[PDB]
Design a protein around this nucleic acid. Structure first.
Ligand SMILES: [Mg+2]
Ligand SMILES: [Mg+2]
Ligand SMILES: [Mg+2]
Ligand SMILES: [Mg+2]
Ligand SMILES: [Mg+2]
Ligand SMILES: [Mg+2]
Ligand SMILES: [Mg+2]
Ligand SMILES: [Mg+2]
Ligand SMILES: [Mg+2]
Ligand SMILES: [Mg+2]
Ligand SMILES: [Mg+2]
Ligand SMILES: [Mg+2]
Ligand SMILES: [Mg+2]
Ligand SMILES: [Mg+2]
Ligand SMILES: [Mg+2]
Ligand SMILES: [Mg+2]
Ligand SMILES: [Mg+2]
Ligand SMILES: [Mg+2]
Ligand SMILES: [Mg+2]
Ligand SMILES: [Mg+2]
Ligand SMILES: [Mg+2]
Ligand SMILES: [Mg+2]
Ligand SMILES: [Mg+2]
Ligand SMILES: [Mg+2]
Ligand SMILES: [Mg+2]
Ligand SMILES: [Mg+2]
Ligand SMILES: [Mg+2]
Ligand SMILES: [Mg+2]
Ligand SMILES: [Mg+2]
Ligand SMILES: [Mg+2]
Ligand SMILES: [Mg+2]
Ligand SMILES: [Mg+2]
Ligand SMILES: [Mg+2]
Ligand SMILES: [Mg+2]
Ligand SMILES: [Mg+2]
Ligand SMILES: [Mg+2]
Ligand SMILES: [Mg+2]
Ligand SMILES: [Mg+2]
Ligand SMILES: [Mg+2]
Ligand SMILES: [Mg+2]
Ligand SMILES: [Mg+2]
Ligand SMILES: [Mg+2]
Ligand SMILES: [Mg+2]
Ligand SMILES: [Mg+2]
Ligand SMILES: [Mg+2]
Ligand SMILES: [Mg+2]
Ligand SMILES: [Mg+2]
Ligand SMILES: [Mg+2]
Ligand SMILES: [Mg+2]
Ligand SMILES: [Mg+2]
Ligand SMILES: [Mg+2]
Ligand SMILES: [Mg+2]
Ligand SMILES: [Zn+2]
Lengths: 224, 82, 127, 211, 99, 114, 100, 147
RNA sequence: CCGCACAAGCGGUGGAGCAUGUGGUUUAAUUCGAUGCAACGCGAAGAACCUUACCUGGUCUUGACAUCCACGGAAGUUUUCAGAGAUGAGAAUGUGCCUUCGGGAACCGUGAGACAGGUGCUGCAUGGCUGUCGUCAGCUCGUGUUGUGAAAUGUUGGGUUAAGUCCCGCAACGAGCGCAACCCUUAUCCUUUGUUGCCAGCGGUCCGGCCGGGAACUCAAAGGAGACUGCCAGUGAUAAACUGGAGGAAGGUGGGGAUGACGUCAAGUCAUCAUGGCCCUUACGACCAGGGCUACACACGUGCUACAAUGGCGCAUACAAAGAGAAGCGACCUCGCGAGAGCAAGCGGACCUCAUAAAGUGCGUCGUAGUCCGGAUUGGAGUCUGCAACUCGACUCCAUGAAGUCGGAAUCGCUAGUAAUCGUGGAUCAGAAUGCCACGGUGAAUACGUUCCCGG
């Protein structure tokens, strides 16, 4: 992504000067209208160097977890993961998703059992109310683990939108040593992101730019 | 009352003992546990020791007693008030 | 032609046959007011037939089993309702909002152990 | 609170009866009385054959018992001499031509009568009740059950007061009627009294009624 | 002339299988069988005090439901009557043949 | 009227009126009436002397009033003199037909005494 | 109950079993109108000499299992306690928890 | 009704007149489910009401009602630490019910050698403001102001 | 924040008579247990004998019940005397079966010891079973995270629900036992089968589905369908849910069952049974007759019938359901005023019998009274069961006709086919229901609300 490509999307935009985090000073161009302005001169090379690492991970058969829980950007992140055959979390990040993966494995097994059971049969043996209740449980499980049913094991890389909002995920990752790739607004604490991208995390246009560029480079890394 | 088609009921050993007594003149009070026997008209002028549960109390049968059961004359419950 | 309906109340059942032509009602080979001694029963059996206003337009041959006089009357009413519904669909829309296709499911509740009746509980003594 | 007998409540739903004859009020009482005498006799003779169950049917004239045990060799012995003596004594104890039958239980660690009998026989040896029931649960679970629960009660280890205690593992839904829960009790006559053991074994839910 | 056969049992699955088998044996032998007619079941109730002592309110209620079926054959031949005579059914079913 | 029972039956229906004689209940009342050929619903008013005399003639056929009271008192007195069980329960004013005395024998015992 | 009780019941049953015809014909004589009232008299005298326990009404239905005198169910011949144990185990055919 | 107060069975109207208020009246007078006995007395009383006290029996019904139906009563509630006799005004159904209750109780307090005559005379006196039901409306209006 | 907890209502209890249980006292003994809710129509689903365990007296000692050992007998059956019976003493008859002929079985009696026997003690030695909080909504665990750690979180919060029900939030995610559902029953429809059940259209009738017949309908009982907040509108973070509406037989877990988590009360039961310890072991065991459990100055609990014209009585007449039956249920007919009796059909029962429902309704009468209310009590005379109704049965008839005129303080039950009333059946049972368990008929009133009362 080129600085012009970002700037038109508005990547330079940031939170209010009232709400910023201390470690973000190096990445901040300045202030306008009491608004923090992010410096694309740092943003572009760091994003490119992160894309290099993501391409490397995906080119060694890496499993990638796209992470974002914004109600606006959930579908964008989900589609972003689907466009590169990867795994995602687009709703509330469940504390213990990585640290307590084994309990999630039982949940993934229950989701697999429910979907397989409906195709196999036995719904007729169940009463209509019971069969409908089982369908509701399957729908709830899908809304909870649609993205990670096929992750199989712990992912090899994480992509995070608004790292401050998803702070539990990054704490888990660091506890596991799983690398964190994150779009970091001025209000976030950048310590947990090993490849940090400072940029807007709310705006739909810039978020979609991040996701599309990452997914293009991930498909490229897969293709070899 | 039992019934009239069946006639009154008397225990056989009382029949035997009573006819023994009436045929052989006066006796001492003959002892009996048969509270369920009916007093019979031949059984008059005799004295019968009916067991009240713990002791044979003597009842001296008379003519207007005929028809009643022996147990009606030997109370089985001691009571004097409180 | 012939139009029947099966009505039921708490424990009664009533077969109702509708024949256009008059306003006579025969119940178990007897006339209405000579079968039912209570007036509210006569009223409740004429209820639907008078609602749809066609009284002297169709005579009724009806039999009924089980239950008491009020249950039999209610079952007869339900049967007449279902029979009329077969004769004309338009009548059913008014019959329903009159509360006649209700088929009330209310029935005597069983006696339960430890109670004197379905719900009456023995007279407890605190002191 | 007190629980309902987890076998009687499932009778007709998922659990079959252990006596399937038909009778009238005339011969109903003495029929099941001879039935009881048959059962007690068989349980006394087969005390070492690990008999899990004893079903009795009564066809038109004869009676036919089926013995579910894990030691079919012990009840069979050699060319069925022992089972033939059993046929004689059963036929004369019921006044009717008998017909004995055997059906081996294959997983003696998954039926509640045999695990309870094993626990009691161990409690005779004055083994630690704790490790006894723990081994029972571990075996039954490892063999493929969906859940199990054991409960011993009464002066455990010769103690002076009764300490009822239990240990469960897996999933034992006692309120679900579909659940095929094999339940059975047993008593252990120790020197300090009687120790009662109850065992529940849940082996999956049954879908589609009795059949 | 007719042969009327009554079947009593304690569970309806077994008795229904028995009726089916009866009528099929009668169909093999070219008879005319009135299909099994269901007759009213007899529920015997029993209420029993569960508590050994003191509690009379705590009880338990049991029920034996005798299921009863009636089959009737109107054009019997020797190969009809013998066929059901060479017929052995489940132990739980009581059969009663009448002419 | 001055029936054999020297009491005076009231001016009600003949049967209910005759029931006032001691020893004449409803059954025996209508027996008296039917045997005298007198109607059932008529009152003692509008009843001729020729009919009252038949009523007296037919009520004299029974044992009523003092004669009945004397017979009942004699039977109880005789029964008491025998020393039989019911004689004792009559002397002690306690129920003789085998009812509870542990509680509610109040008709025989009268009101309560602490 | 005590073994002597079960023994008394066995003796009563066995005794009432052997004198049944005698009791029946004596009762028939006694109740028979048109008896000569000498026959009826010696009939009642002869009847009251038979063993008291030869009366069917002297017997008392006890649990075949435990011999308990109360809580009997003629249908099963067991007390109220043993029927429950037998039913929950599945020994009484067709019997099950009723609920309506 | 701690969670939600539930309404009443909307009773079915009188078969003789199609009115539902006379239906509630016959339900009030009914004893031991003897509805036939009740409606007999009610019809007998309204018929003679239509004669001894002018025409319009169904109208004379409310002529007695509006004469007895109260407006204010007391509802002793302890919103201040003790049961305080605070007065309250009623909805229409409350005063309807209290009116019919007060009618039937006074009728039962008359004798009059019949319940038909009892109810008839009592309802007439109520319609023209005589008797005891009207007096117990007077007292319920009197003690409603006493505190 | 919940619950008939109160409130709002309706009917009661507390007063009267009787039924029954307990306490008390008495007694020869009034068997033993249950004791605040959660003992007190409870164990006992049924004490005249029996039961029965208690008492008085009469009796037995390897025993009434079981195994073993020798010895002798077939086993039985019938009959007499003494006795209250247990028991003794006999007299007659039979002396059988299988046999490898030796005996053996079958039982019976006598003898001797192991032993039997105990409803004797301890439920504070126990199992088993049950009550209770409470069908109240809770109780936890794994893994994760935080803390050196004991631990905490989850399970708190905001909503909502009958519910730890569900949603949203939240370092928690999950699960398990509970909750809900699966089960039974009830409400609608469909399919299949149609006698002993059914009778619409048919013909025939003695007018009776009774008879040809019919399989439609009611029913019977096996399969299925149906209800899910699915549809609509409105509230609500849009969510959960809530309020209404449509359709529908049924609407918001449709009604009612069964189902009772972790635990609490050293709760109840050693007298169902089983059982550790101990105690008796010619006695704390066993048999028999009679008595008691039914006593009565009293006290309490639970019921029944009442006090009346919304009723009593007489006559007439209509509509149920659910059950039981072979030492059983027992029709028709005759006899009796009646309880019942004689004769005897049918029925192991959709067939026959119990068995004609009652309140109701029509007509007549009674006129507010201790009554034509009420039926207690008592006298007389009967019937039935049963060896036997004295103690101490039920019922019938005639006579008698108490108290009682709606019950102080206080207190109980109930939210709909409920309460209240009205009959019917069953278990136990020879006989003995006002109790218990079921069944239908008629059929309400009220809920402003959560301040208080009780409990959670
Ligand atoms: Mg039957
Ligand atoms: Mg009389
Ligand atoms: Mg008595
Ligand atoms: Mg014993
Ligand atoms: Mg008896
Ligand atoms: Mg209450
Ligand atoms: Mg109140
Ligand atoms: Mg009282
Ligand atoms: Mg006592
Ligand atoms: Mg009770
Ligand atoms: Mg009792
Ligand atoms: Mg002695
Ligand atoms: Mg002698
Ligand atoms: Mg000896
Ligand atoms: Mg011993
Ligand atoms: Mg305890
Ligand atoms: Mg609940
Ligand atoms: Mg909350
Ligand atoms: Mg839950
Ligand atoms: Mg939470
Ligand atoms: Mg159908
Ligand atoms: Mg035909
Ligand atoms: Mg058909
Ligand atoms: Mg069905
Ligand atoms: Mg609608
Ligand atoms: Mg609606
Ligand atoms: Mg539902
Ligand atoms: Mg439900
Ligand atoms: Mg449940
Ligand atoms: Mg329970
Ligand atoms: Mg204790
Ligand atoms: Mg207790
Ligand atoms: Mg002794
Ligand atoms: Mg004795
Ligand atoms: Mg007693
Ligand atoms: Mg009277
Ligand atoms: Mg009549
Ligand atoms: Mg019976
Ligand atoms: Mg006659
Ligand atoms: Mg007769
Ligand atoms: Mg009867
Ligand atoms: Mg009457
Ligand atoms: Mg009448
Ligand atoms: Mg009087
Ligand atoms: Mg007075
Ligand atoms: Mg008065
Ligand atoms: Mg409620
Ligand atoms: Mg009743
Ligand atoms: Mg009986
Ligand atoms: Mg009754
Ligand atoms: Mg009822
Ligand atoms: Mg409180
Ligand atoms: Zn941001």
């Amino acid at each position: 992504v080129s600085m012009r490509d970002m700037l038109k999307a508005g990547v330079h935009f940031g939170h209010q000067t009232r709400y910023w985090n201390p470690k973000m000073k190096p990445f901040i161009f300045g202030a306008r209208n009491k608004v923090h302005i992010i410096n694309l001169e740092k943003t572009v090379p760091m994003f490119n160097e992160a894309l290099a690492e993501l391409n490397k991970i995906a080119s060694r058969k890496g499993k990638i977890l796209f992470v974002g829980t914004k109600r606006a950007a959930s579908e964008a992140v989900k589609d972003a993961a689907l466009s590169c055959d990867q795994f995602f979390v687009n709703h509330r990040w469940l504390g213990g998703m990585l640290t307590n993966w084994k309990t999630v494995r039982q949940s993934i097994k229950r989701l697999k059992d429910l979907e397989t059971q409906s195709q196999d049969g036995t719904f007729d043996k169940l009463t209509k109310k019971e069969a409908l209740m089982r369908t509701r449980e399957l729908e709830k499980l899908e809304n909870s683990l649609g993205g990670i049913k096929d992750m199989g094991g712990l992912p090899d890389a994480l992509f995070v939108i608004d790292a401050d909002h998803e702070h539990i995920a990054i704490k888990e990752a660091n506890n596991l040593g799983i690398p964190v790739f994150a779009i970091v607004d001025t209000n976030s604490d950048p310590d947990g992101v090993d490849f940090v991208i400072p940029g807007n995390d709310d705006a739909i246009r810039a978020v979609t730019l991040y996701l599309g560029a990452v997914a293009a480079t991930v498909r490229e890394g897969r293709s070899q | 009352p039992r019934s009239l088609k069946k006639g009154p009921f008397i225990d056989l050993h009382l029949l035997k003992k009573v006819e023994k007594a009436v045929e052989s003149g006066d006796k001492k009070p003959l002892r009996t546990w048969s509270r369920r026997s009916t007093i019979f008209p031949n059984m008059i002028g005799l004295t019968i020791a009916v067991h009240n549960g713990r002791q044979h109390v003597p009842v001296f049968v008379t003519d207007e007693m005929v028809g009643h059961k022996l147990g009606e004359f030997a109370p089985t419950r001691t009571y004097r008030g409180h | 032609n012939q139009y029947y309906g099966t009505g039921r109340r708490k424990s009664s059942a009533a077969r109702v046959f509708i024949k256009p032509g008059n306003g006579k009602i025969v119940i178990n080979q007897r006339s209405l007011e000579q079968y039912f001694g209570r007036e509210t029963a006569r009223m409740v059996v004429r209820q639907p037939l008078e609602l749809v206003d066609m009284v002297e337009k169709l005579d009724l041959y009806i039999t009924v089993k089980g239950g008491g006089i009020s249950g039999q009357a209610g079952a007869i009413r339900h049967g007449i309702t279902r029979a009329l519904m077969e004769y004309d669909e338009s009548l059913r829309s008014e019959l329903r909002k009159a509360g006649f296709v209700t088929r009330d499911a209310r029935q005597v509740e069983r006696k339960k152990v430890g109670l004197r009746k379905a719900r009456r509980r023995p007279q407890f003594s605190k002191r | 609170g007190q629980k309902v007998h987890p076998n009687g409540i499932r009778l007709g739903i998922v659990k079959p009866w252990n006596s399937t004859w038909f009778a009238n009020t005339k011969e109903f009482a003495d029929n099941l009385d001879s039935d009881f005498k048959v059962r007690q006799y068989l349980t006394k003779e087969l005390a070492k054959a690990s008999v899990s169950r004893i079903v009795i049917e009564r066809p038109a004239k004869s009676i036919r018992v089926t013995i579910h045990t894990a030691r079919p060799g012990i009840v069979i012995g050699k060319k069925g001499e022992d089972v033939e003596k059993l046929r004689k004594v059963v036929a004369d104890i019921a006044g009717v031509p008998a017909q004995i039958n055997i059906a081996e239980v294959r997983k003696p660690e998954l039926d509640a009568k045999l695990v309870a009998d094993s626990i009691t026989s161990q409690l005779e040896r004055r083994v630690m009740f704790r490790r006894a029931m723990k081994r029972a649960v571990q075996n039954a679970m490892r063999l493929g059950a969906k859940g199990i629960k054991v409960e011993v009660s009464g002066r455990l280890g010769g103690a002076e007061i009764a300490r009822t205690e239990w240990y469960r593992e897996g999933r034992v839904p006692l309120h679900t009627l579909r659940a095929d829960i094999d339940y059975n009790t047993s008593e252990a006559h120790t020197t300090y009294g009687v120790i009662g053991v109850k065992v529940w074994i849940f082996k999956g839910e049954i879908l589609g009624g009795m059949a | 002339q007719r042969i009327r056969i009554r079947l009593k049992a304690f569970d309806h699955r077994l008795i229904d299988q028995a009726t089916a088998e009866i009528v099929e044996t009668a169909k093999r032998t070219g008879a005319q069988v009135r299909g099994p007619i269901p007759l009213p079941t007899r529920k015997e109730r029993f209420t029993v005090l569960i508590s050994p002592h003191v509690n009379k309110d705590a009880r338990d209620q049991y029920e034996i439901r005798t299921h009863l079926r009636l089959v009737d054959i109107v054009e019997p031949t020797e190969k009809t009557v013998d066929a059901l005579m060479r017929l052995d059914l489940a132990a739980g079913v009581d059969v009663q043949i009448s002419l | 009227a001055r029936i054999a029972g020297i009491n005076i039956p009231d001016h009600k229906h003949a049967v209910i009126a005759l029931t006032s004689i001691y020893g004449v209940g409803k059954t025996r009342s209508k027996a008296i009436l039917a045997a005298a050929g007198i109607a059932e619903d008529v009152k003692i008013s509008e009843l001729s002397e020729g009919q009252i005399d038949t009523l007296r003639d037919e009520v004299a056929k029974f044992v009523v009033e003092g004669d009945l009271r004397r017979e009942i008192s004699m039977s109880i007195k005789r029964l008491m003199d025998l020393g039989c069980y019911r004689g004792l329960r009559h002397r002690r004013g306690l129920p003789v037909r085998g009812q509870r005395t542990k509680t509610n024998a109040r008709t025989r015992k009268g009101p309560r005494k602490p | 109950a005590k073994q002597s009780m079960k023994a008394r019941e066995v003796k009563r049953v066995a005794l009432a079993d052997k004198y049944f015809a005698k009791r029946a014909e004596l009762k028939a004589i006694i109740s028979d109108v048109n008896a000569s009232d000498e026959d009826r008299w010696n009939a009642v005298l002869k009847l009251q000499t038979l063993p008291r326990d030869s009366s069917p009404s002297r017997q008392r239905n006890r649990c075949r299992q435990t011999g308990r005198p109360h809580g009997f169910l003629r249908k099963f011949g067991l007390s109220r306690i043993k029927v429950r144990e037998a039913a929950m185990r599945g020994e009484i055919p067709g019997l099950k928890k009723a609920s309506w | 009704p701690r969670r939600r107060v539930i309404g009443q069975r909307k009773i079915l109207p009188d078969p003789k007149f199609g009115s539902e208020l006379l239906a509630k009246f016959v339900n009030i007078l009914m004893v031991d489910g003897k509805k036939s006995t009740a409606e007999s007395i009610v019809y007998s009383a309204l018929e003679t009401l239509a004669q001894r006290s002018g025409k319009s029996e169904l109208e004379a019904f409310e002529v007695a009602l509006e004469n007895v139906r109260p407006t204010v009563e007391v509802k002793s509630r302890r919103v201040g630490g003790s049961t305080y006799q605070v007065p309250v005004e009623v909805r229409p159904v409350r005063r309807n019910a209290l009116a019919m209750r007060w009618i039937v109780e006074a009728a039962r307090k008359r004798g009059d050698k019949s319940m038909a005559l009892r109810l008839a005379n009592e309802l007439s006196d109520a319609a023209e403001n005589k008797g005891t039901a009207v007096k117990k409306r007077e007292d319920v209006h009197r003690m409603a102001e006493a505190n």
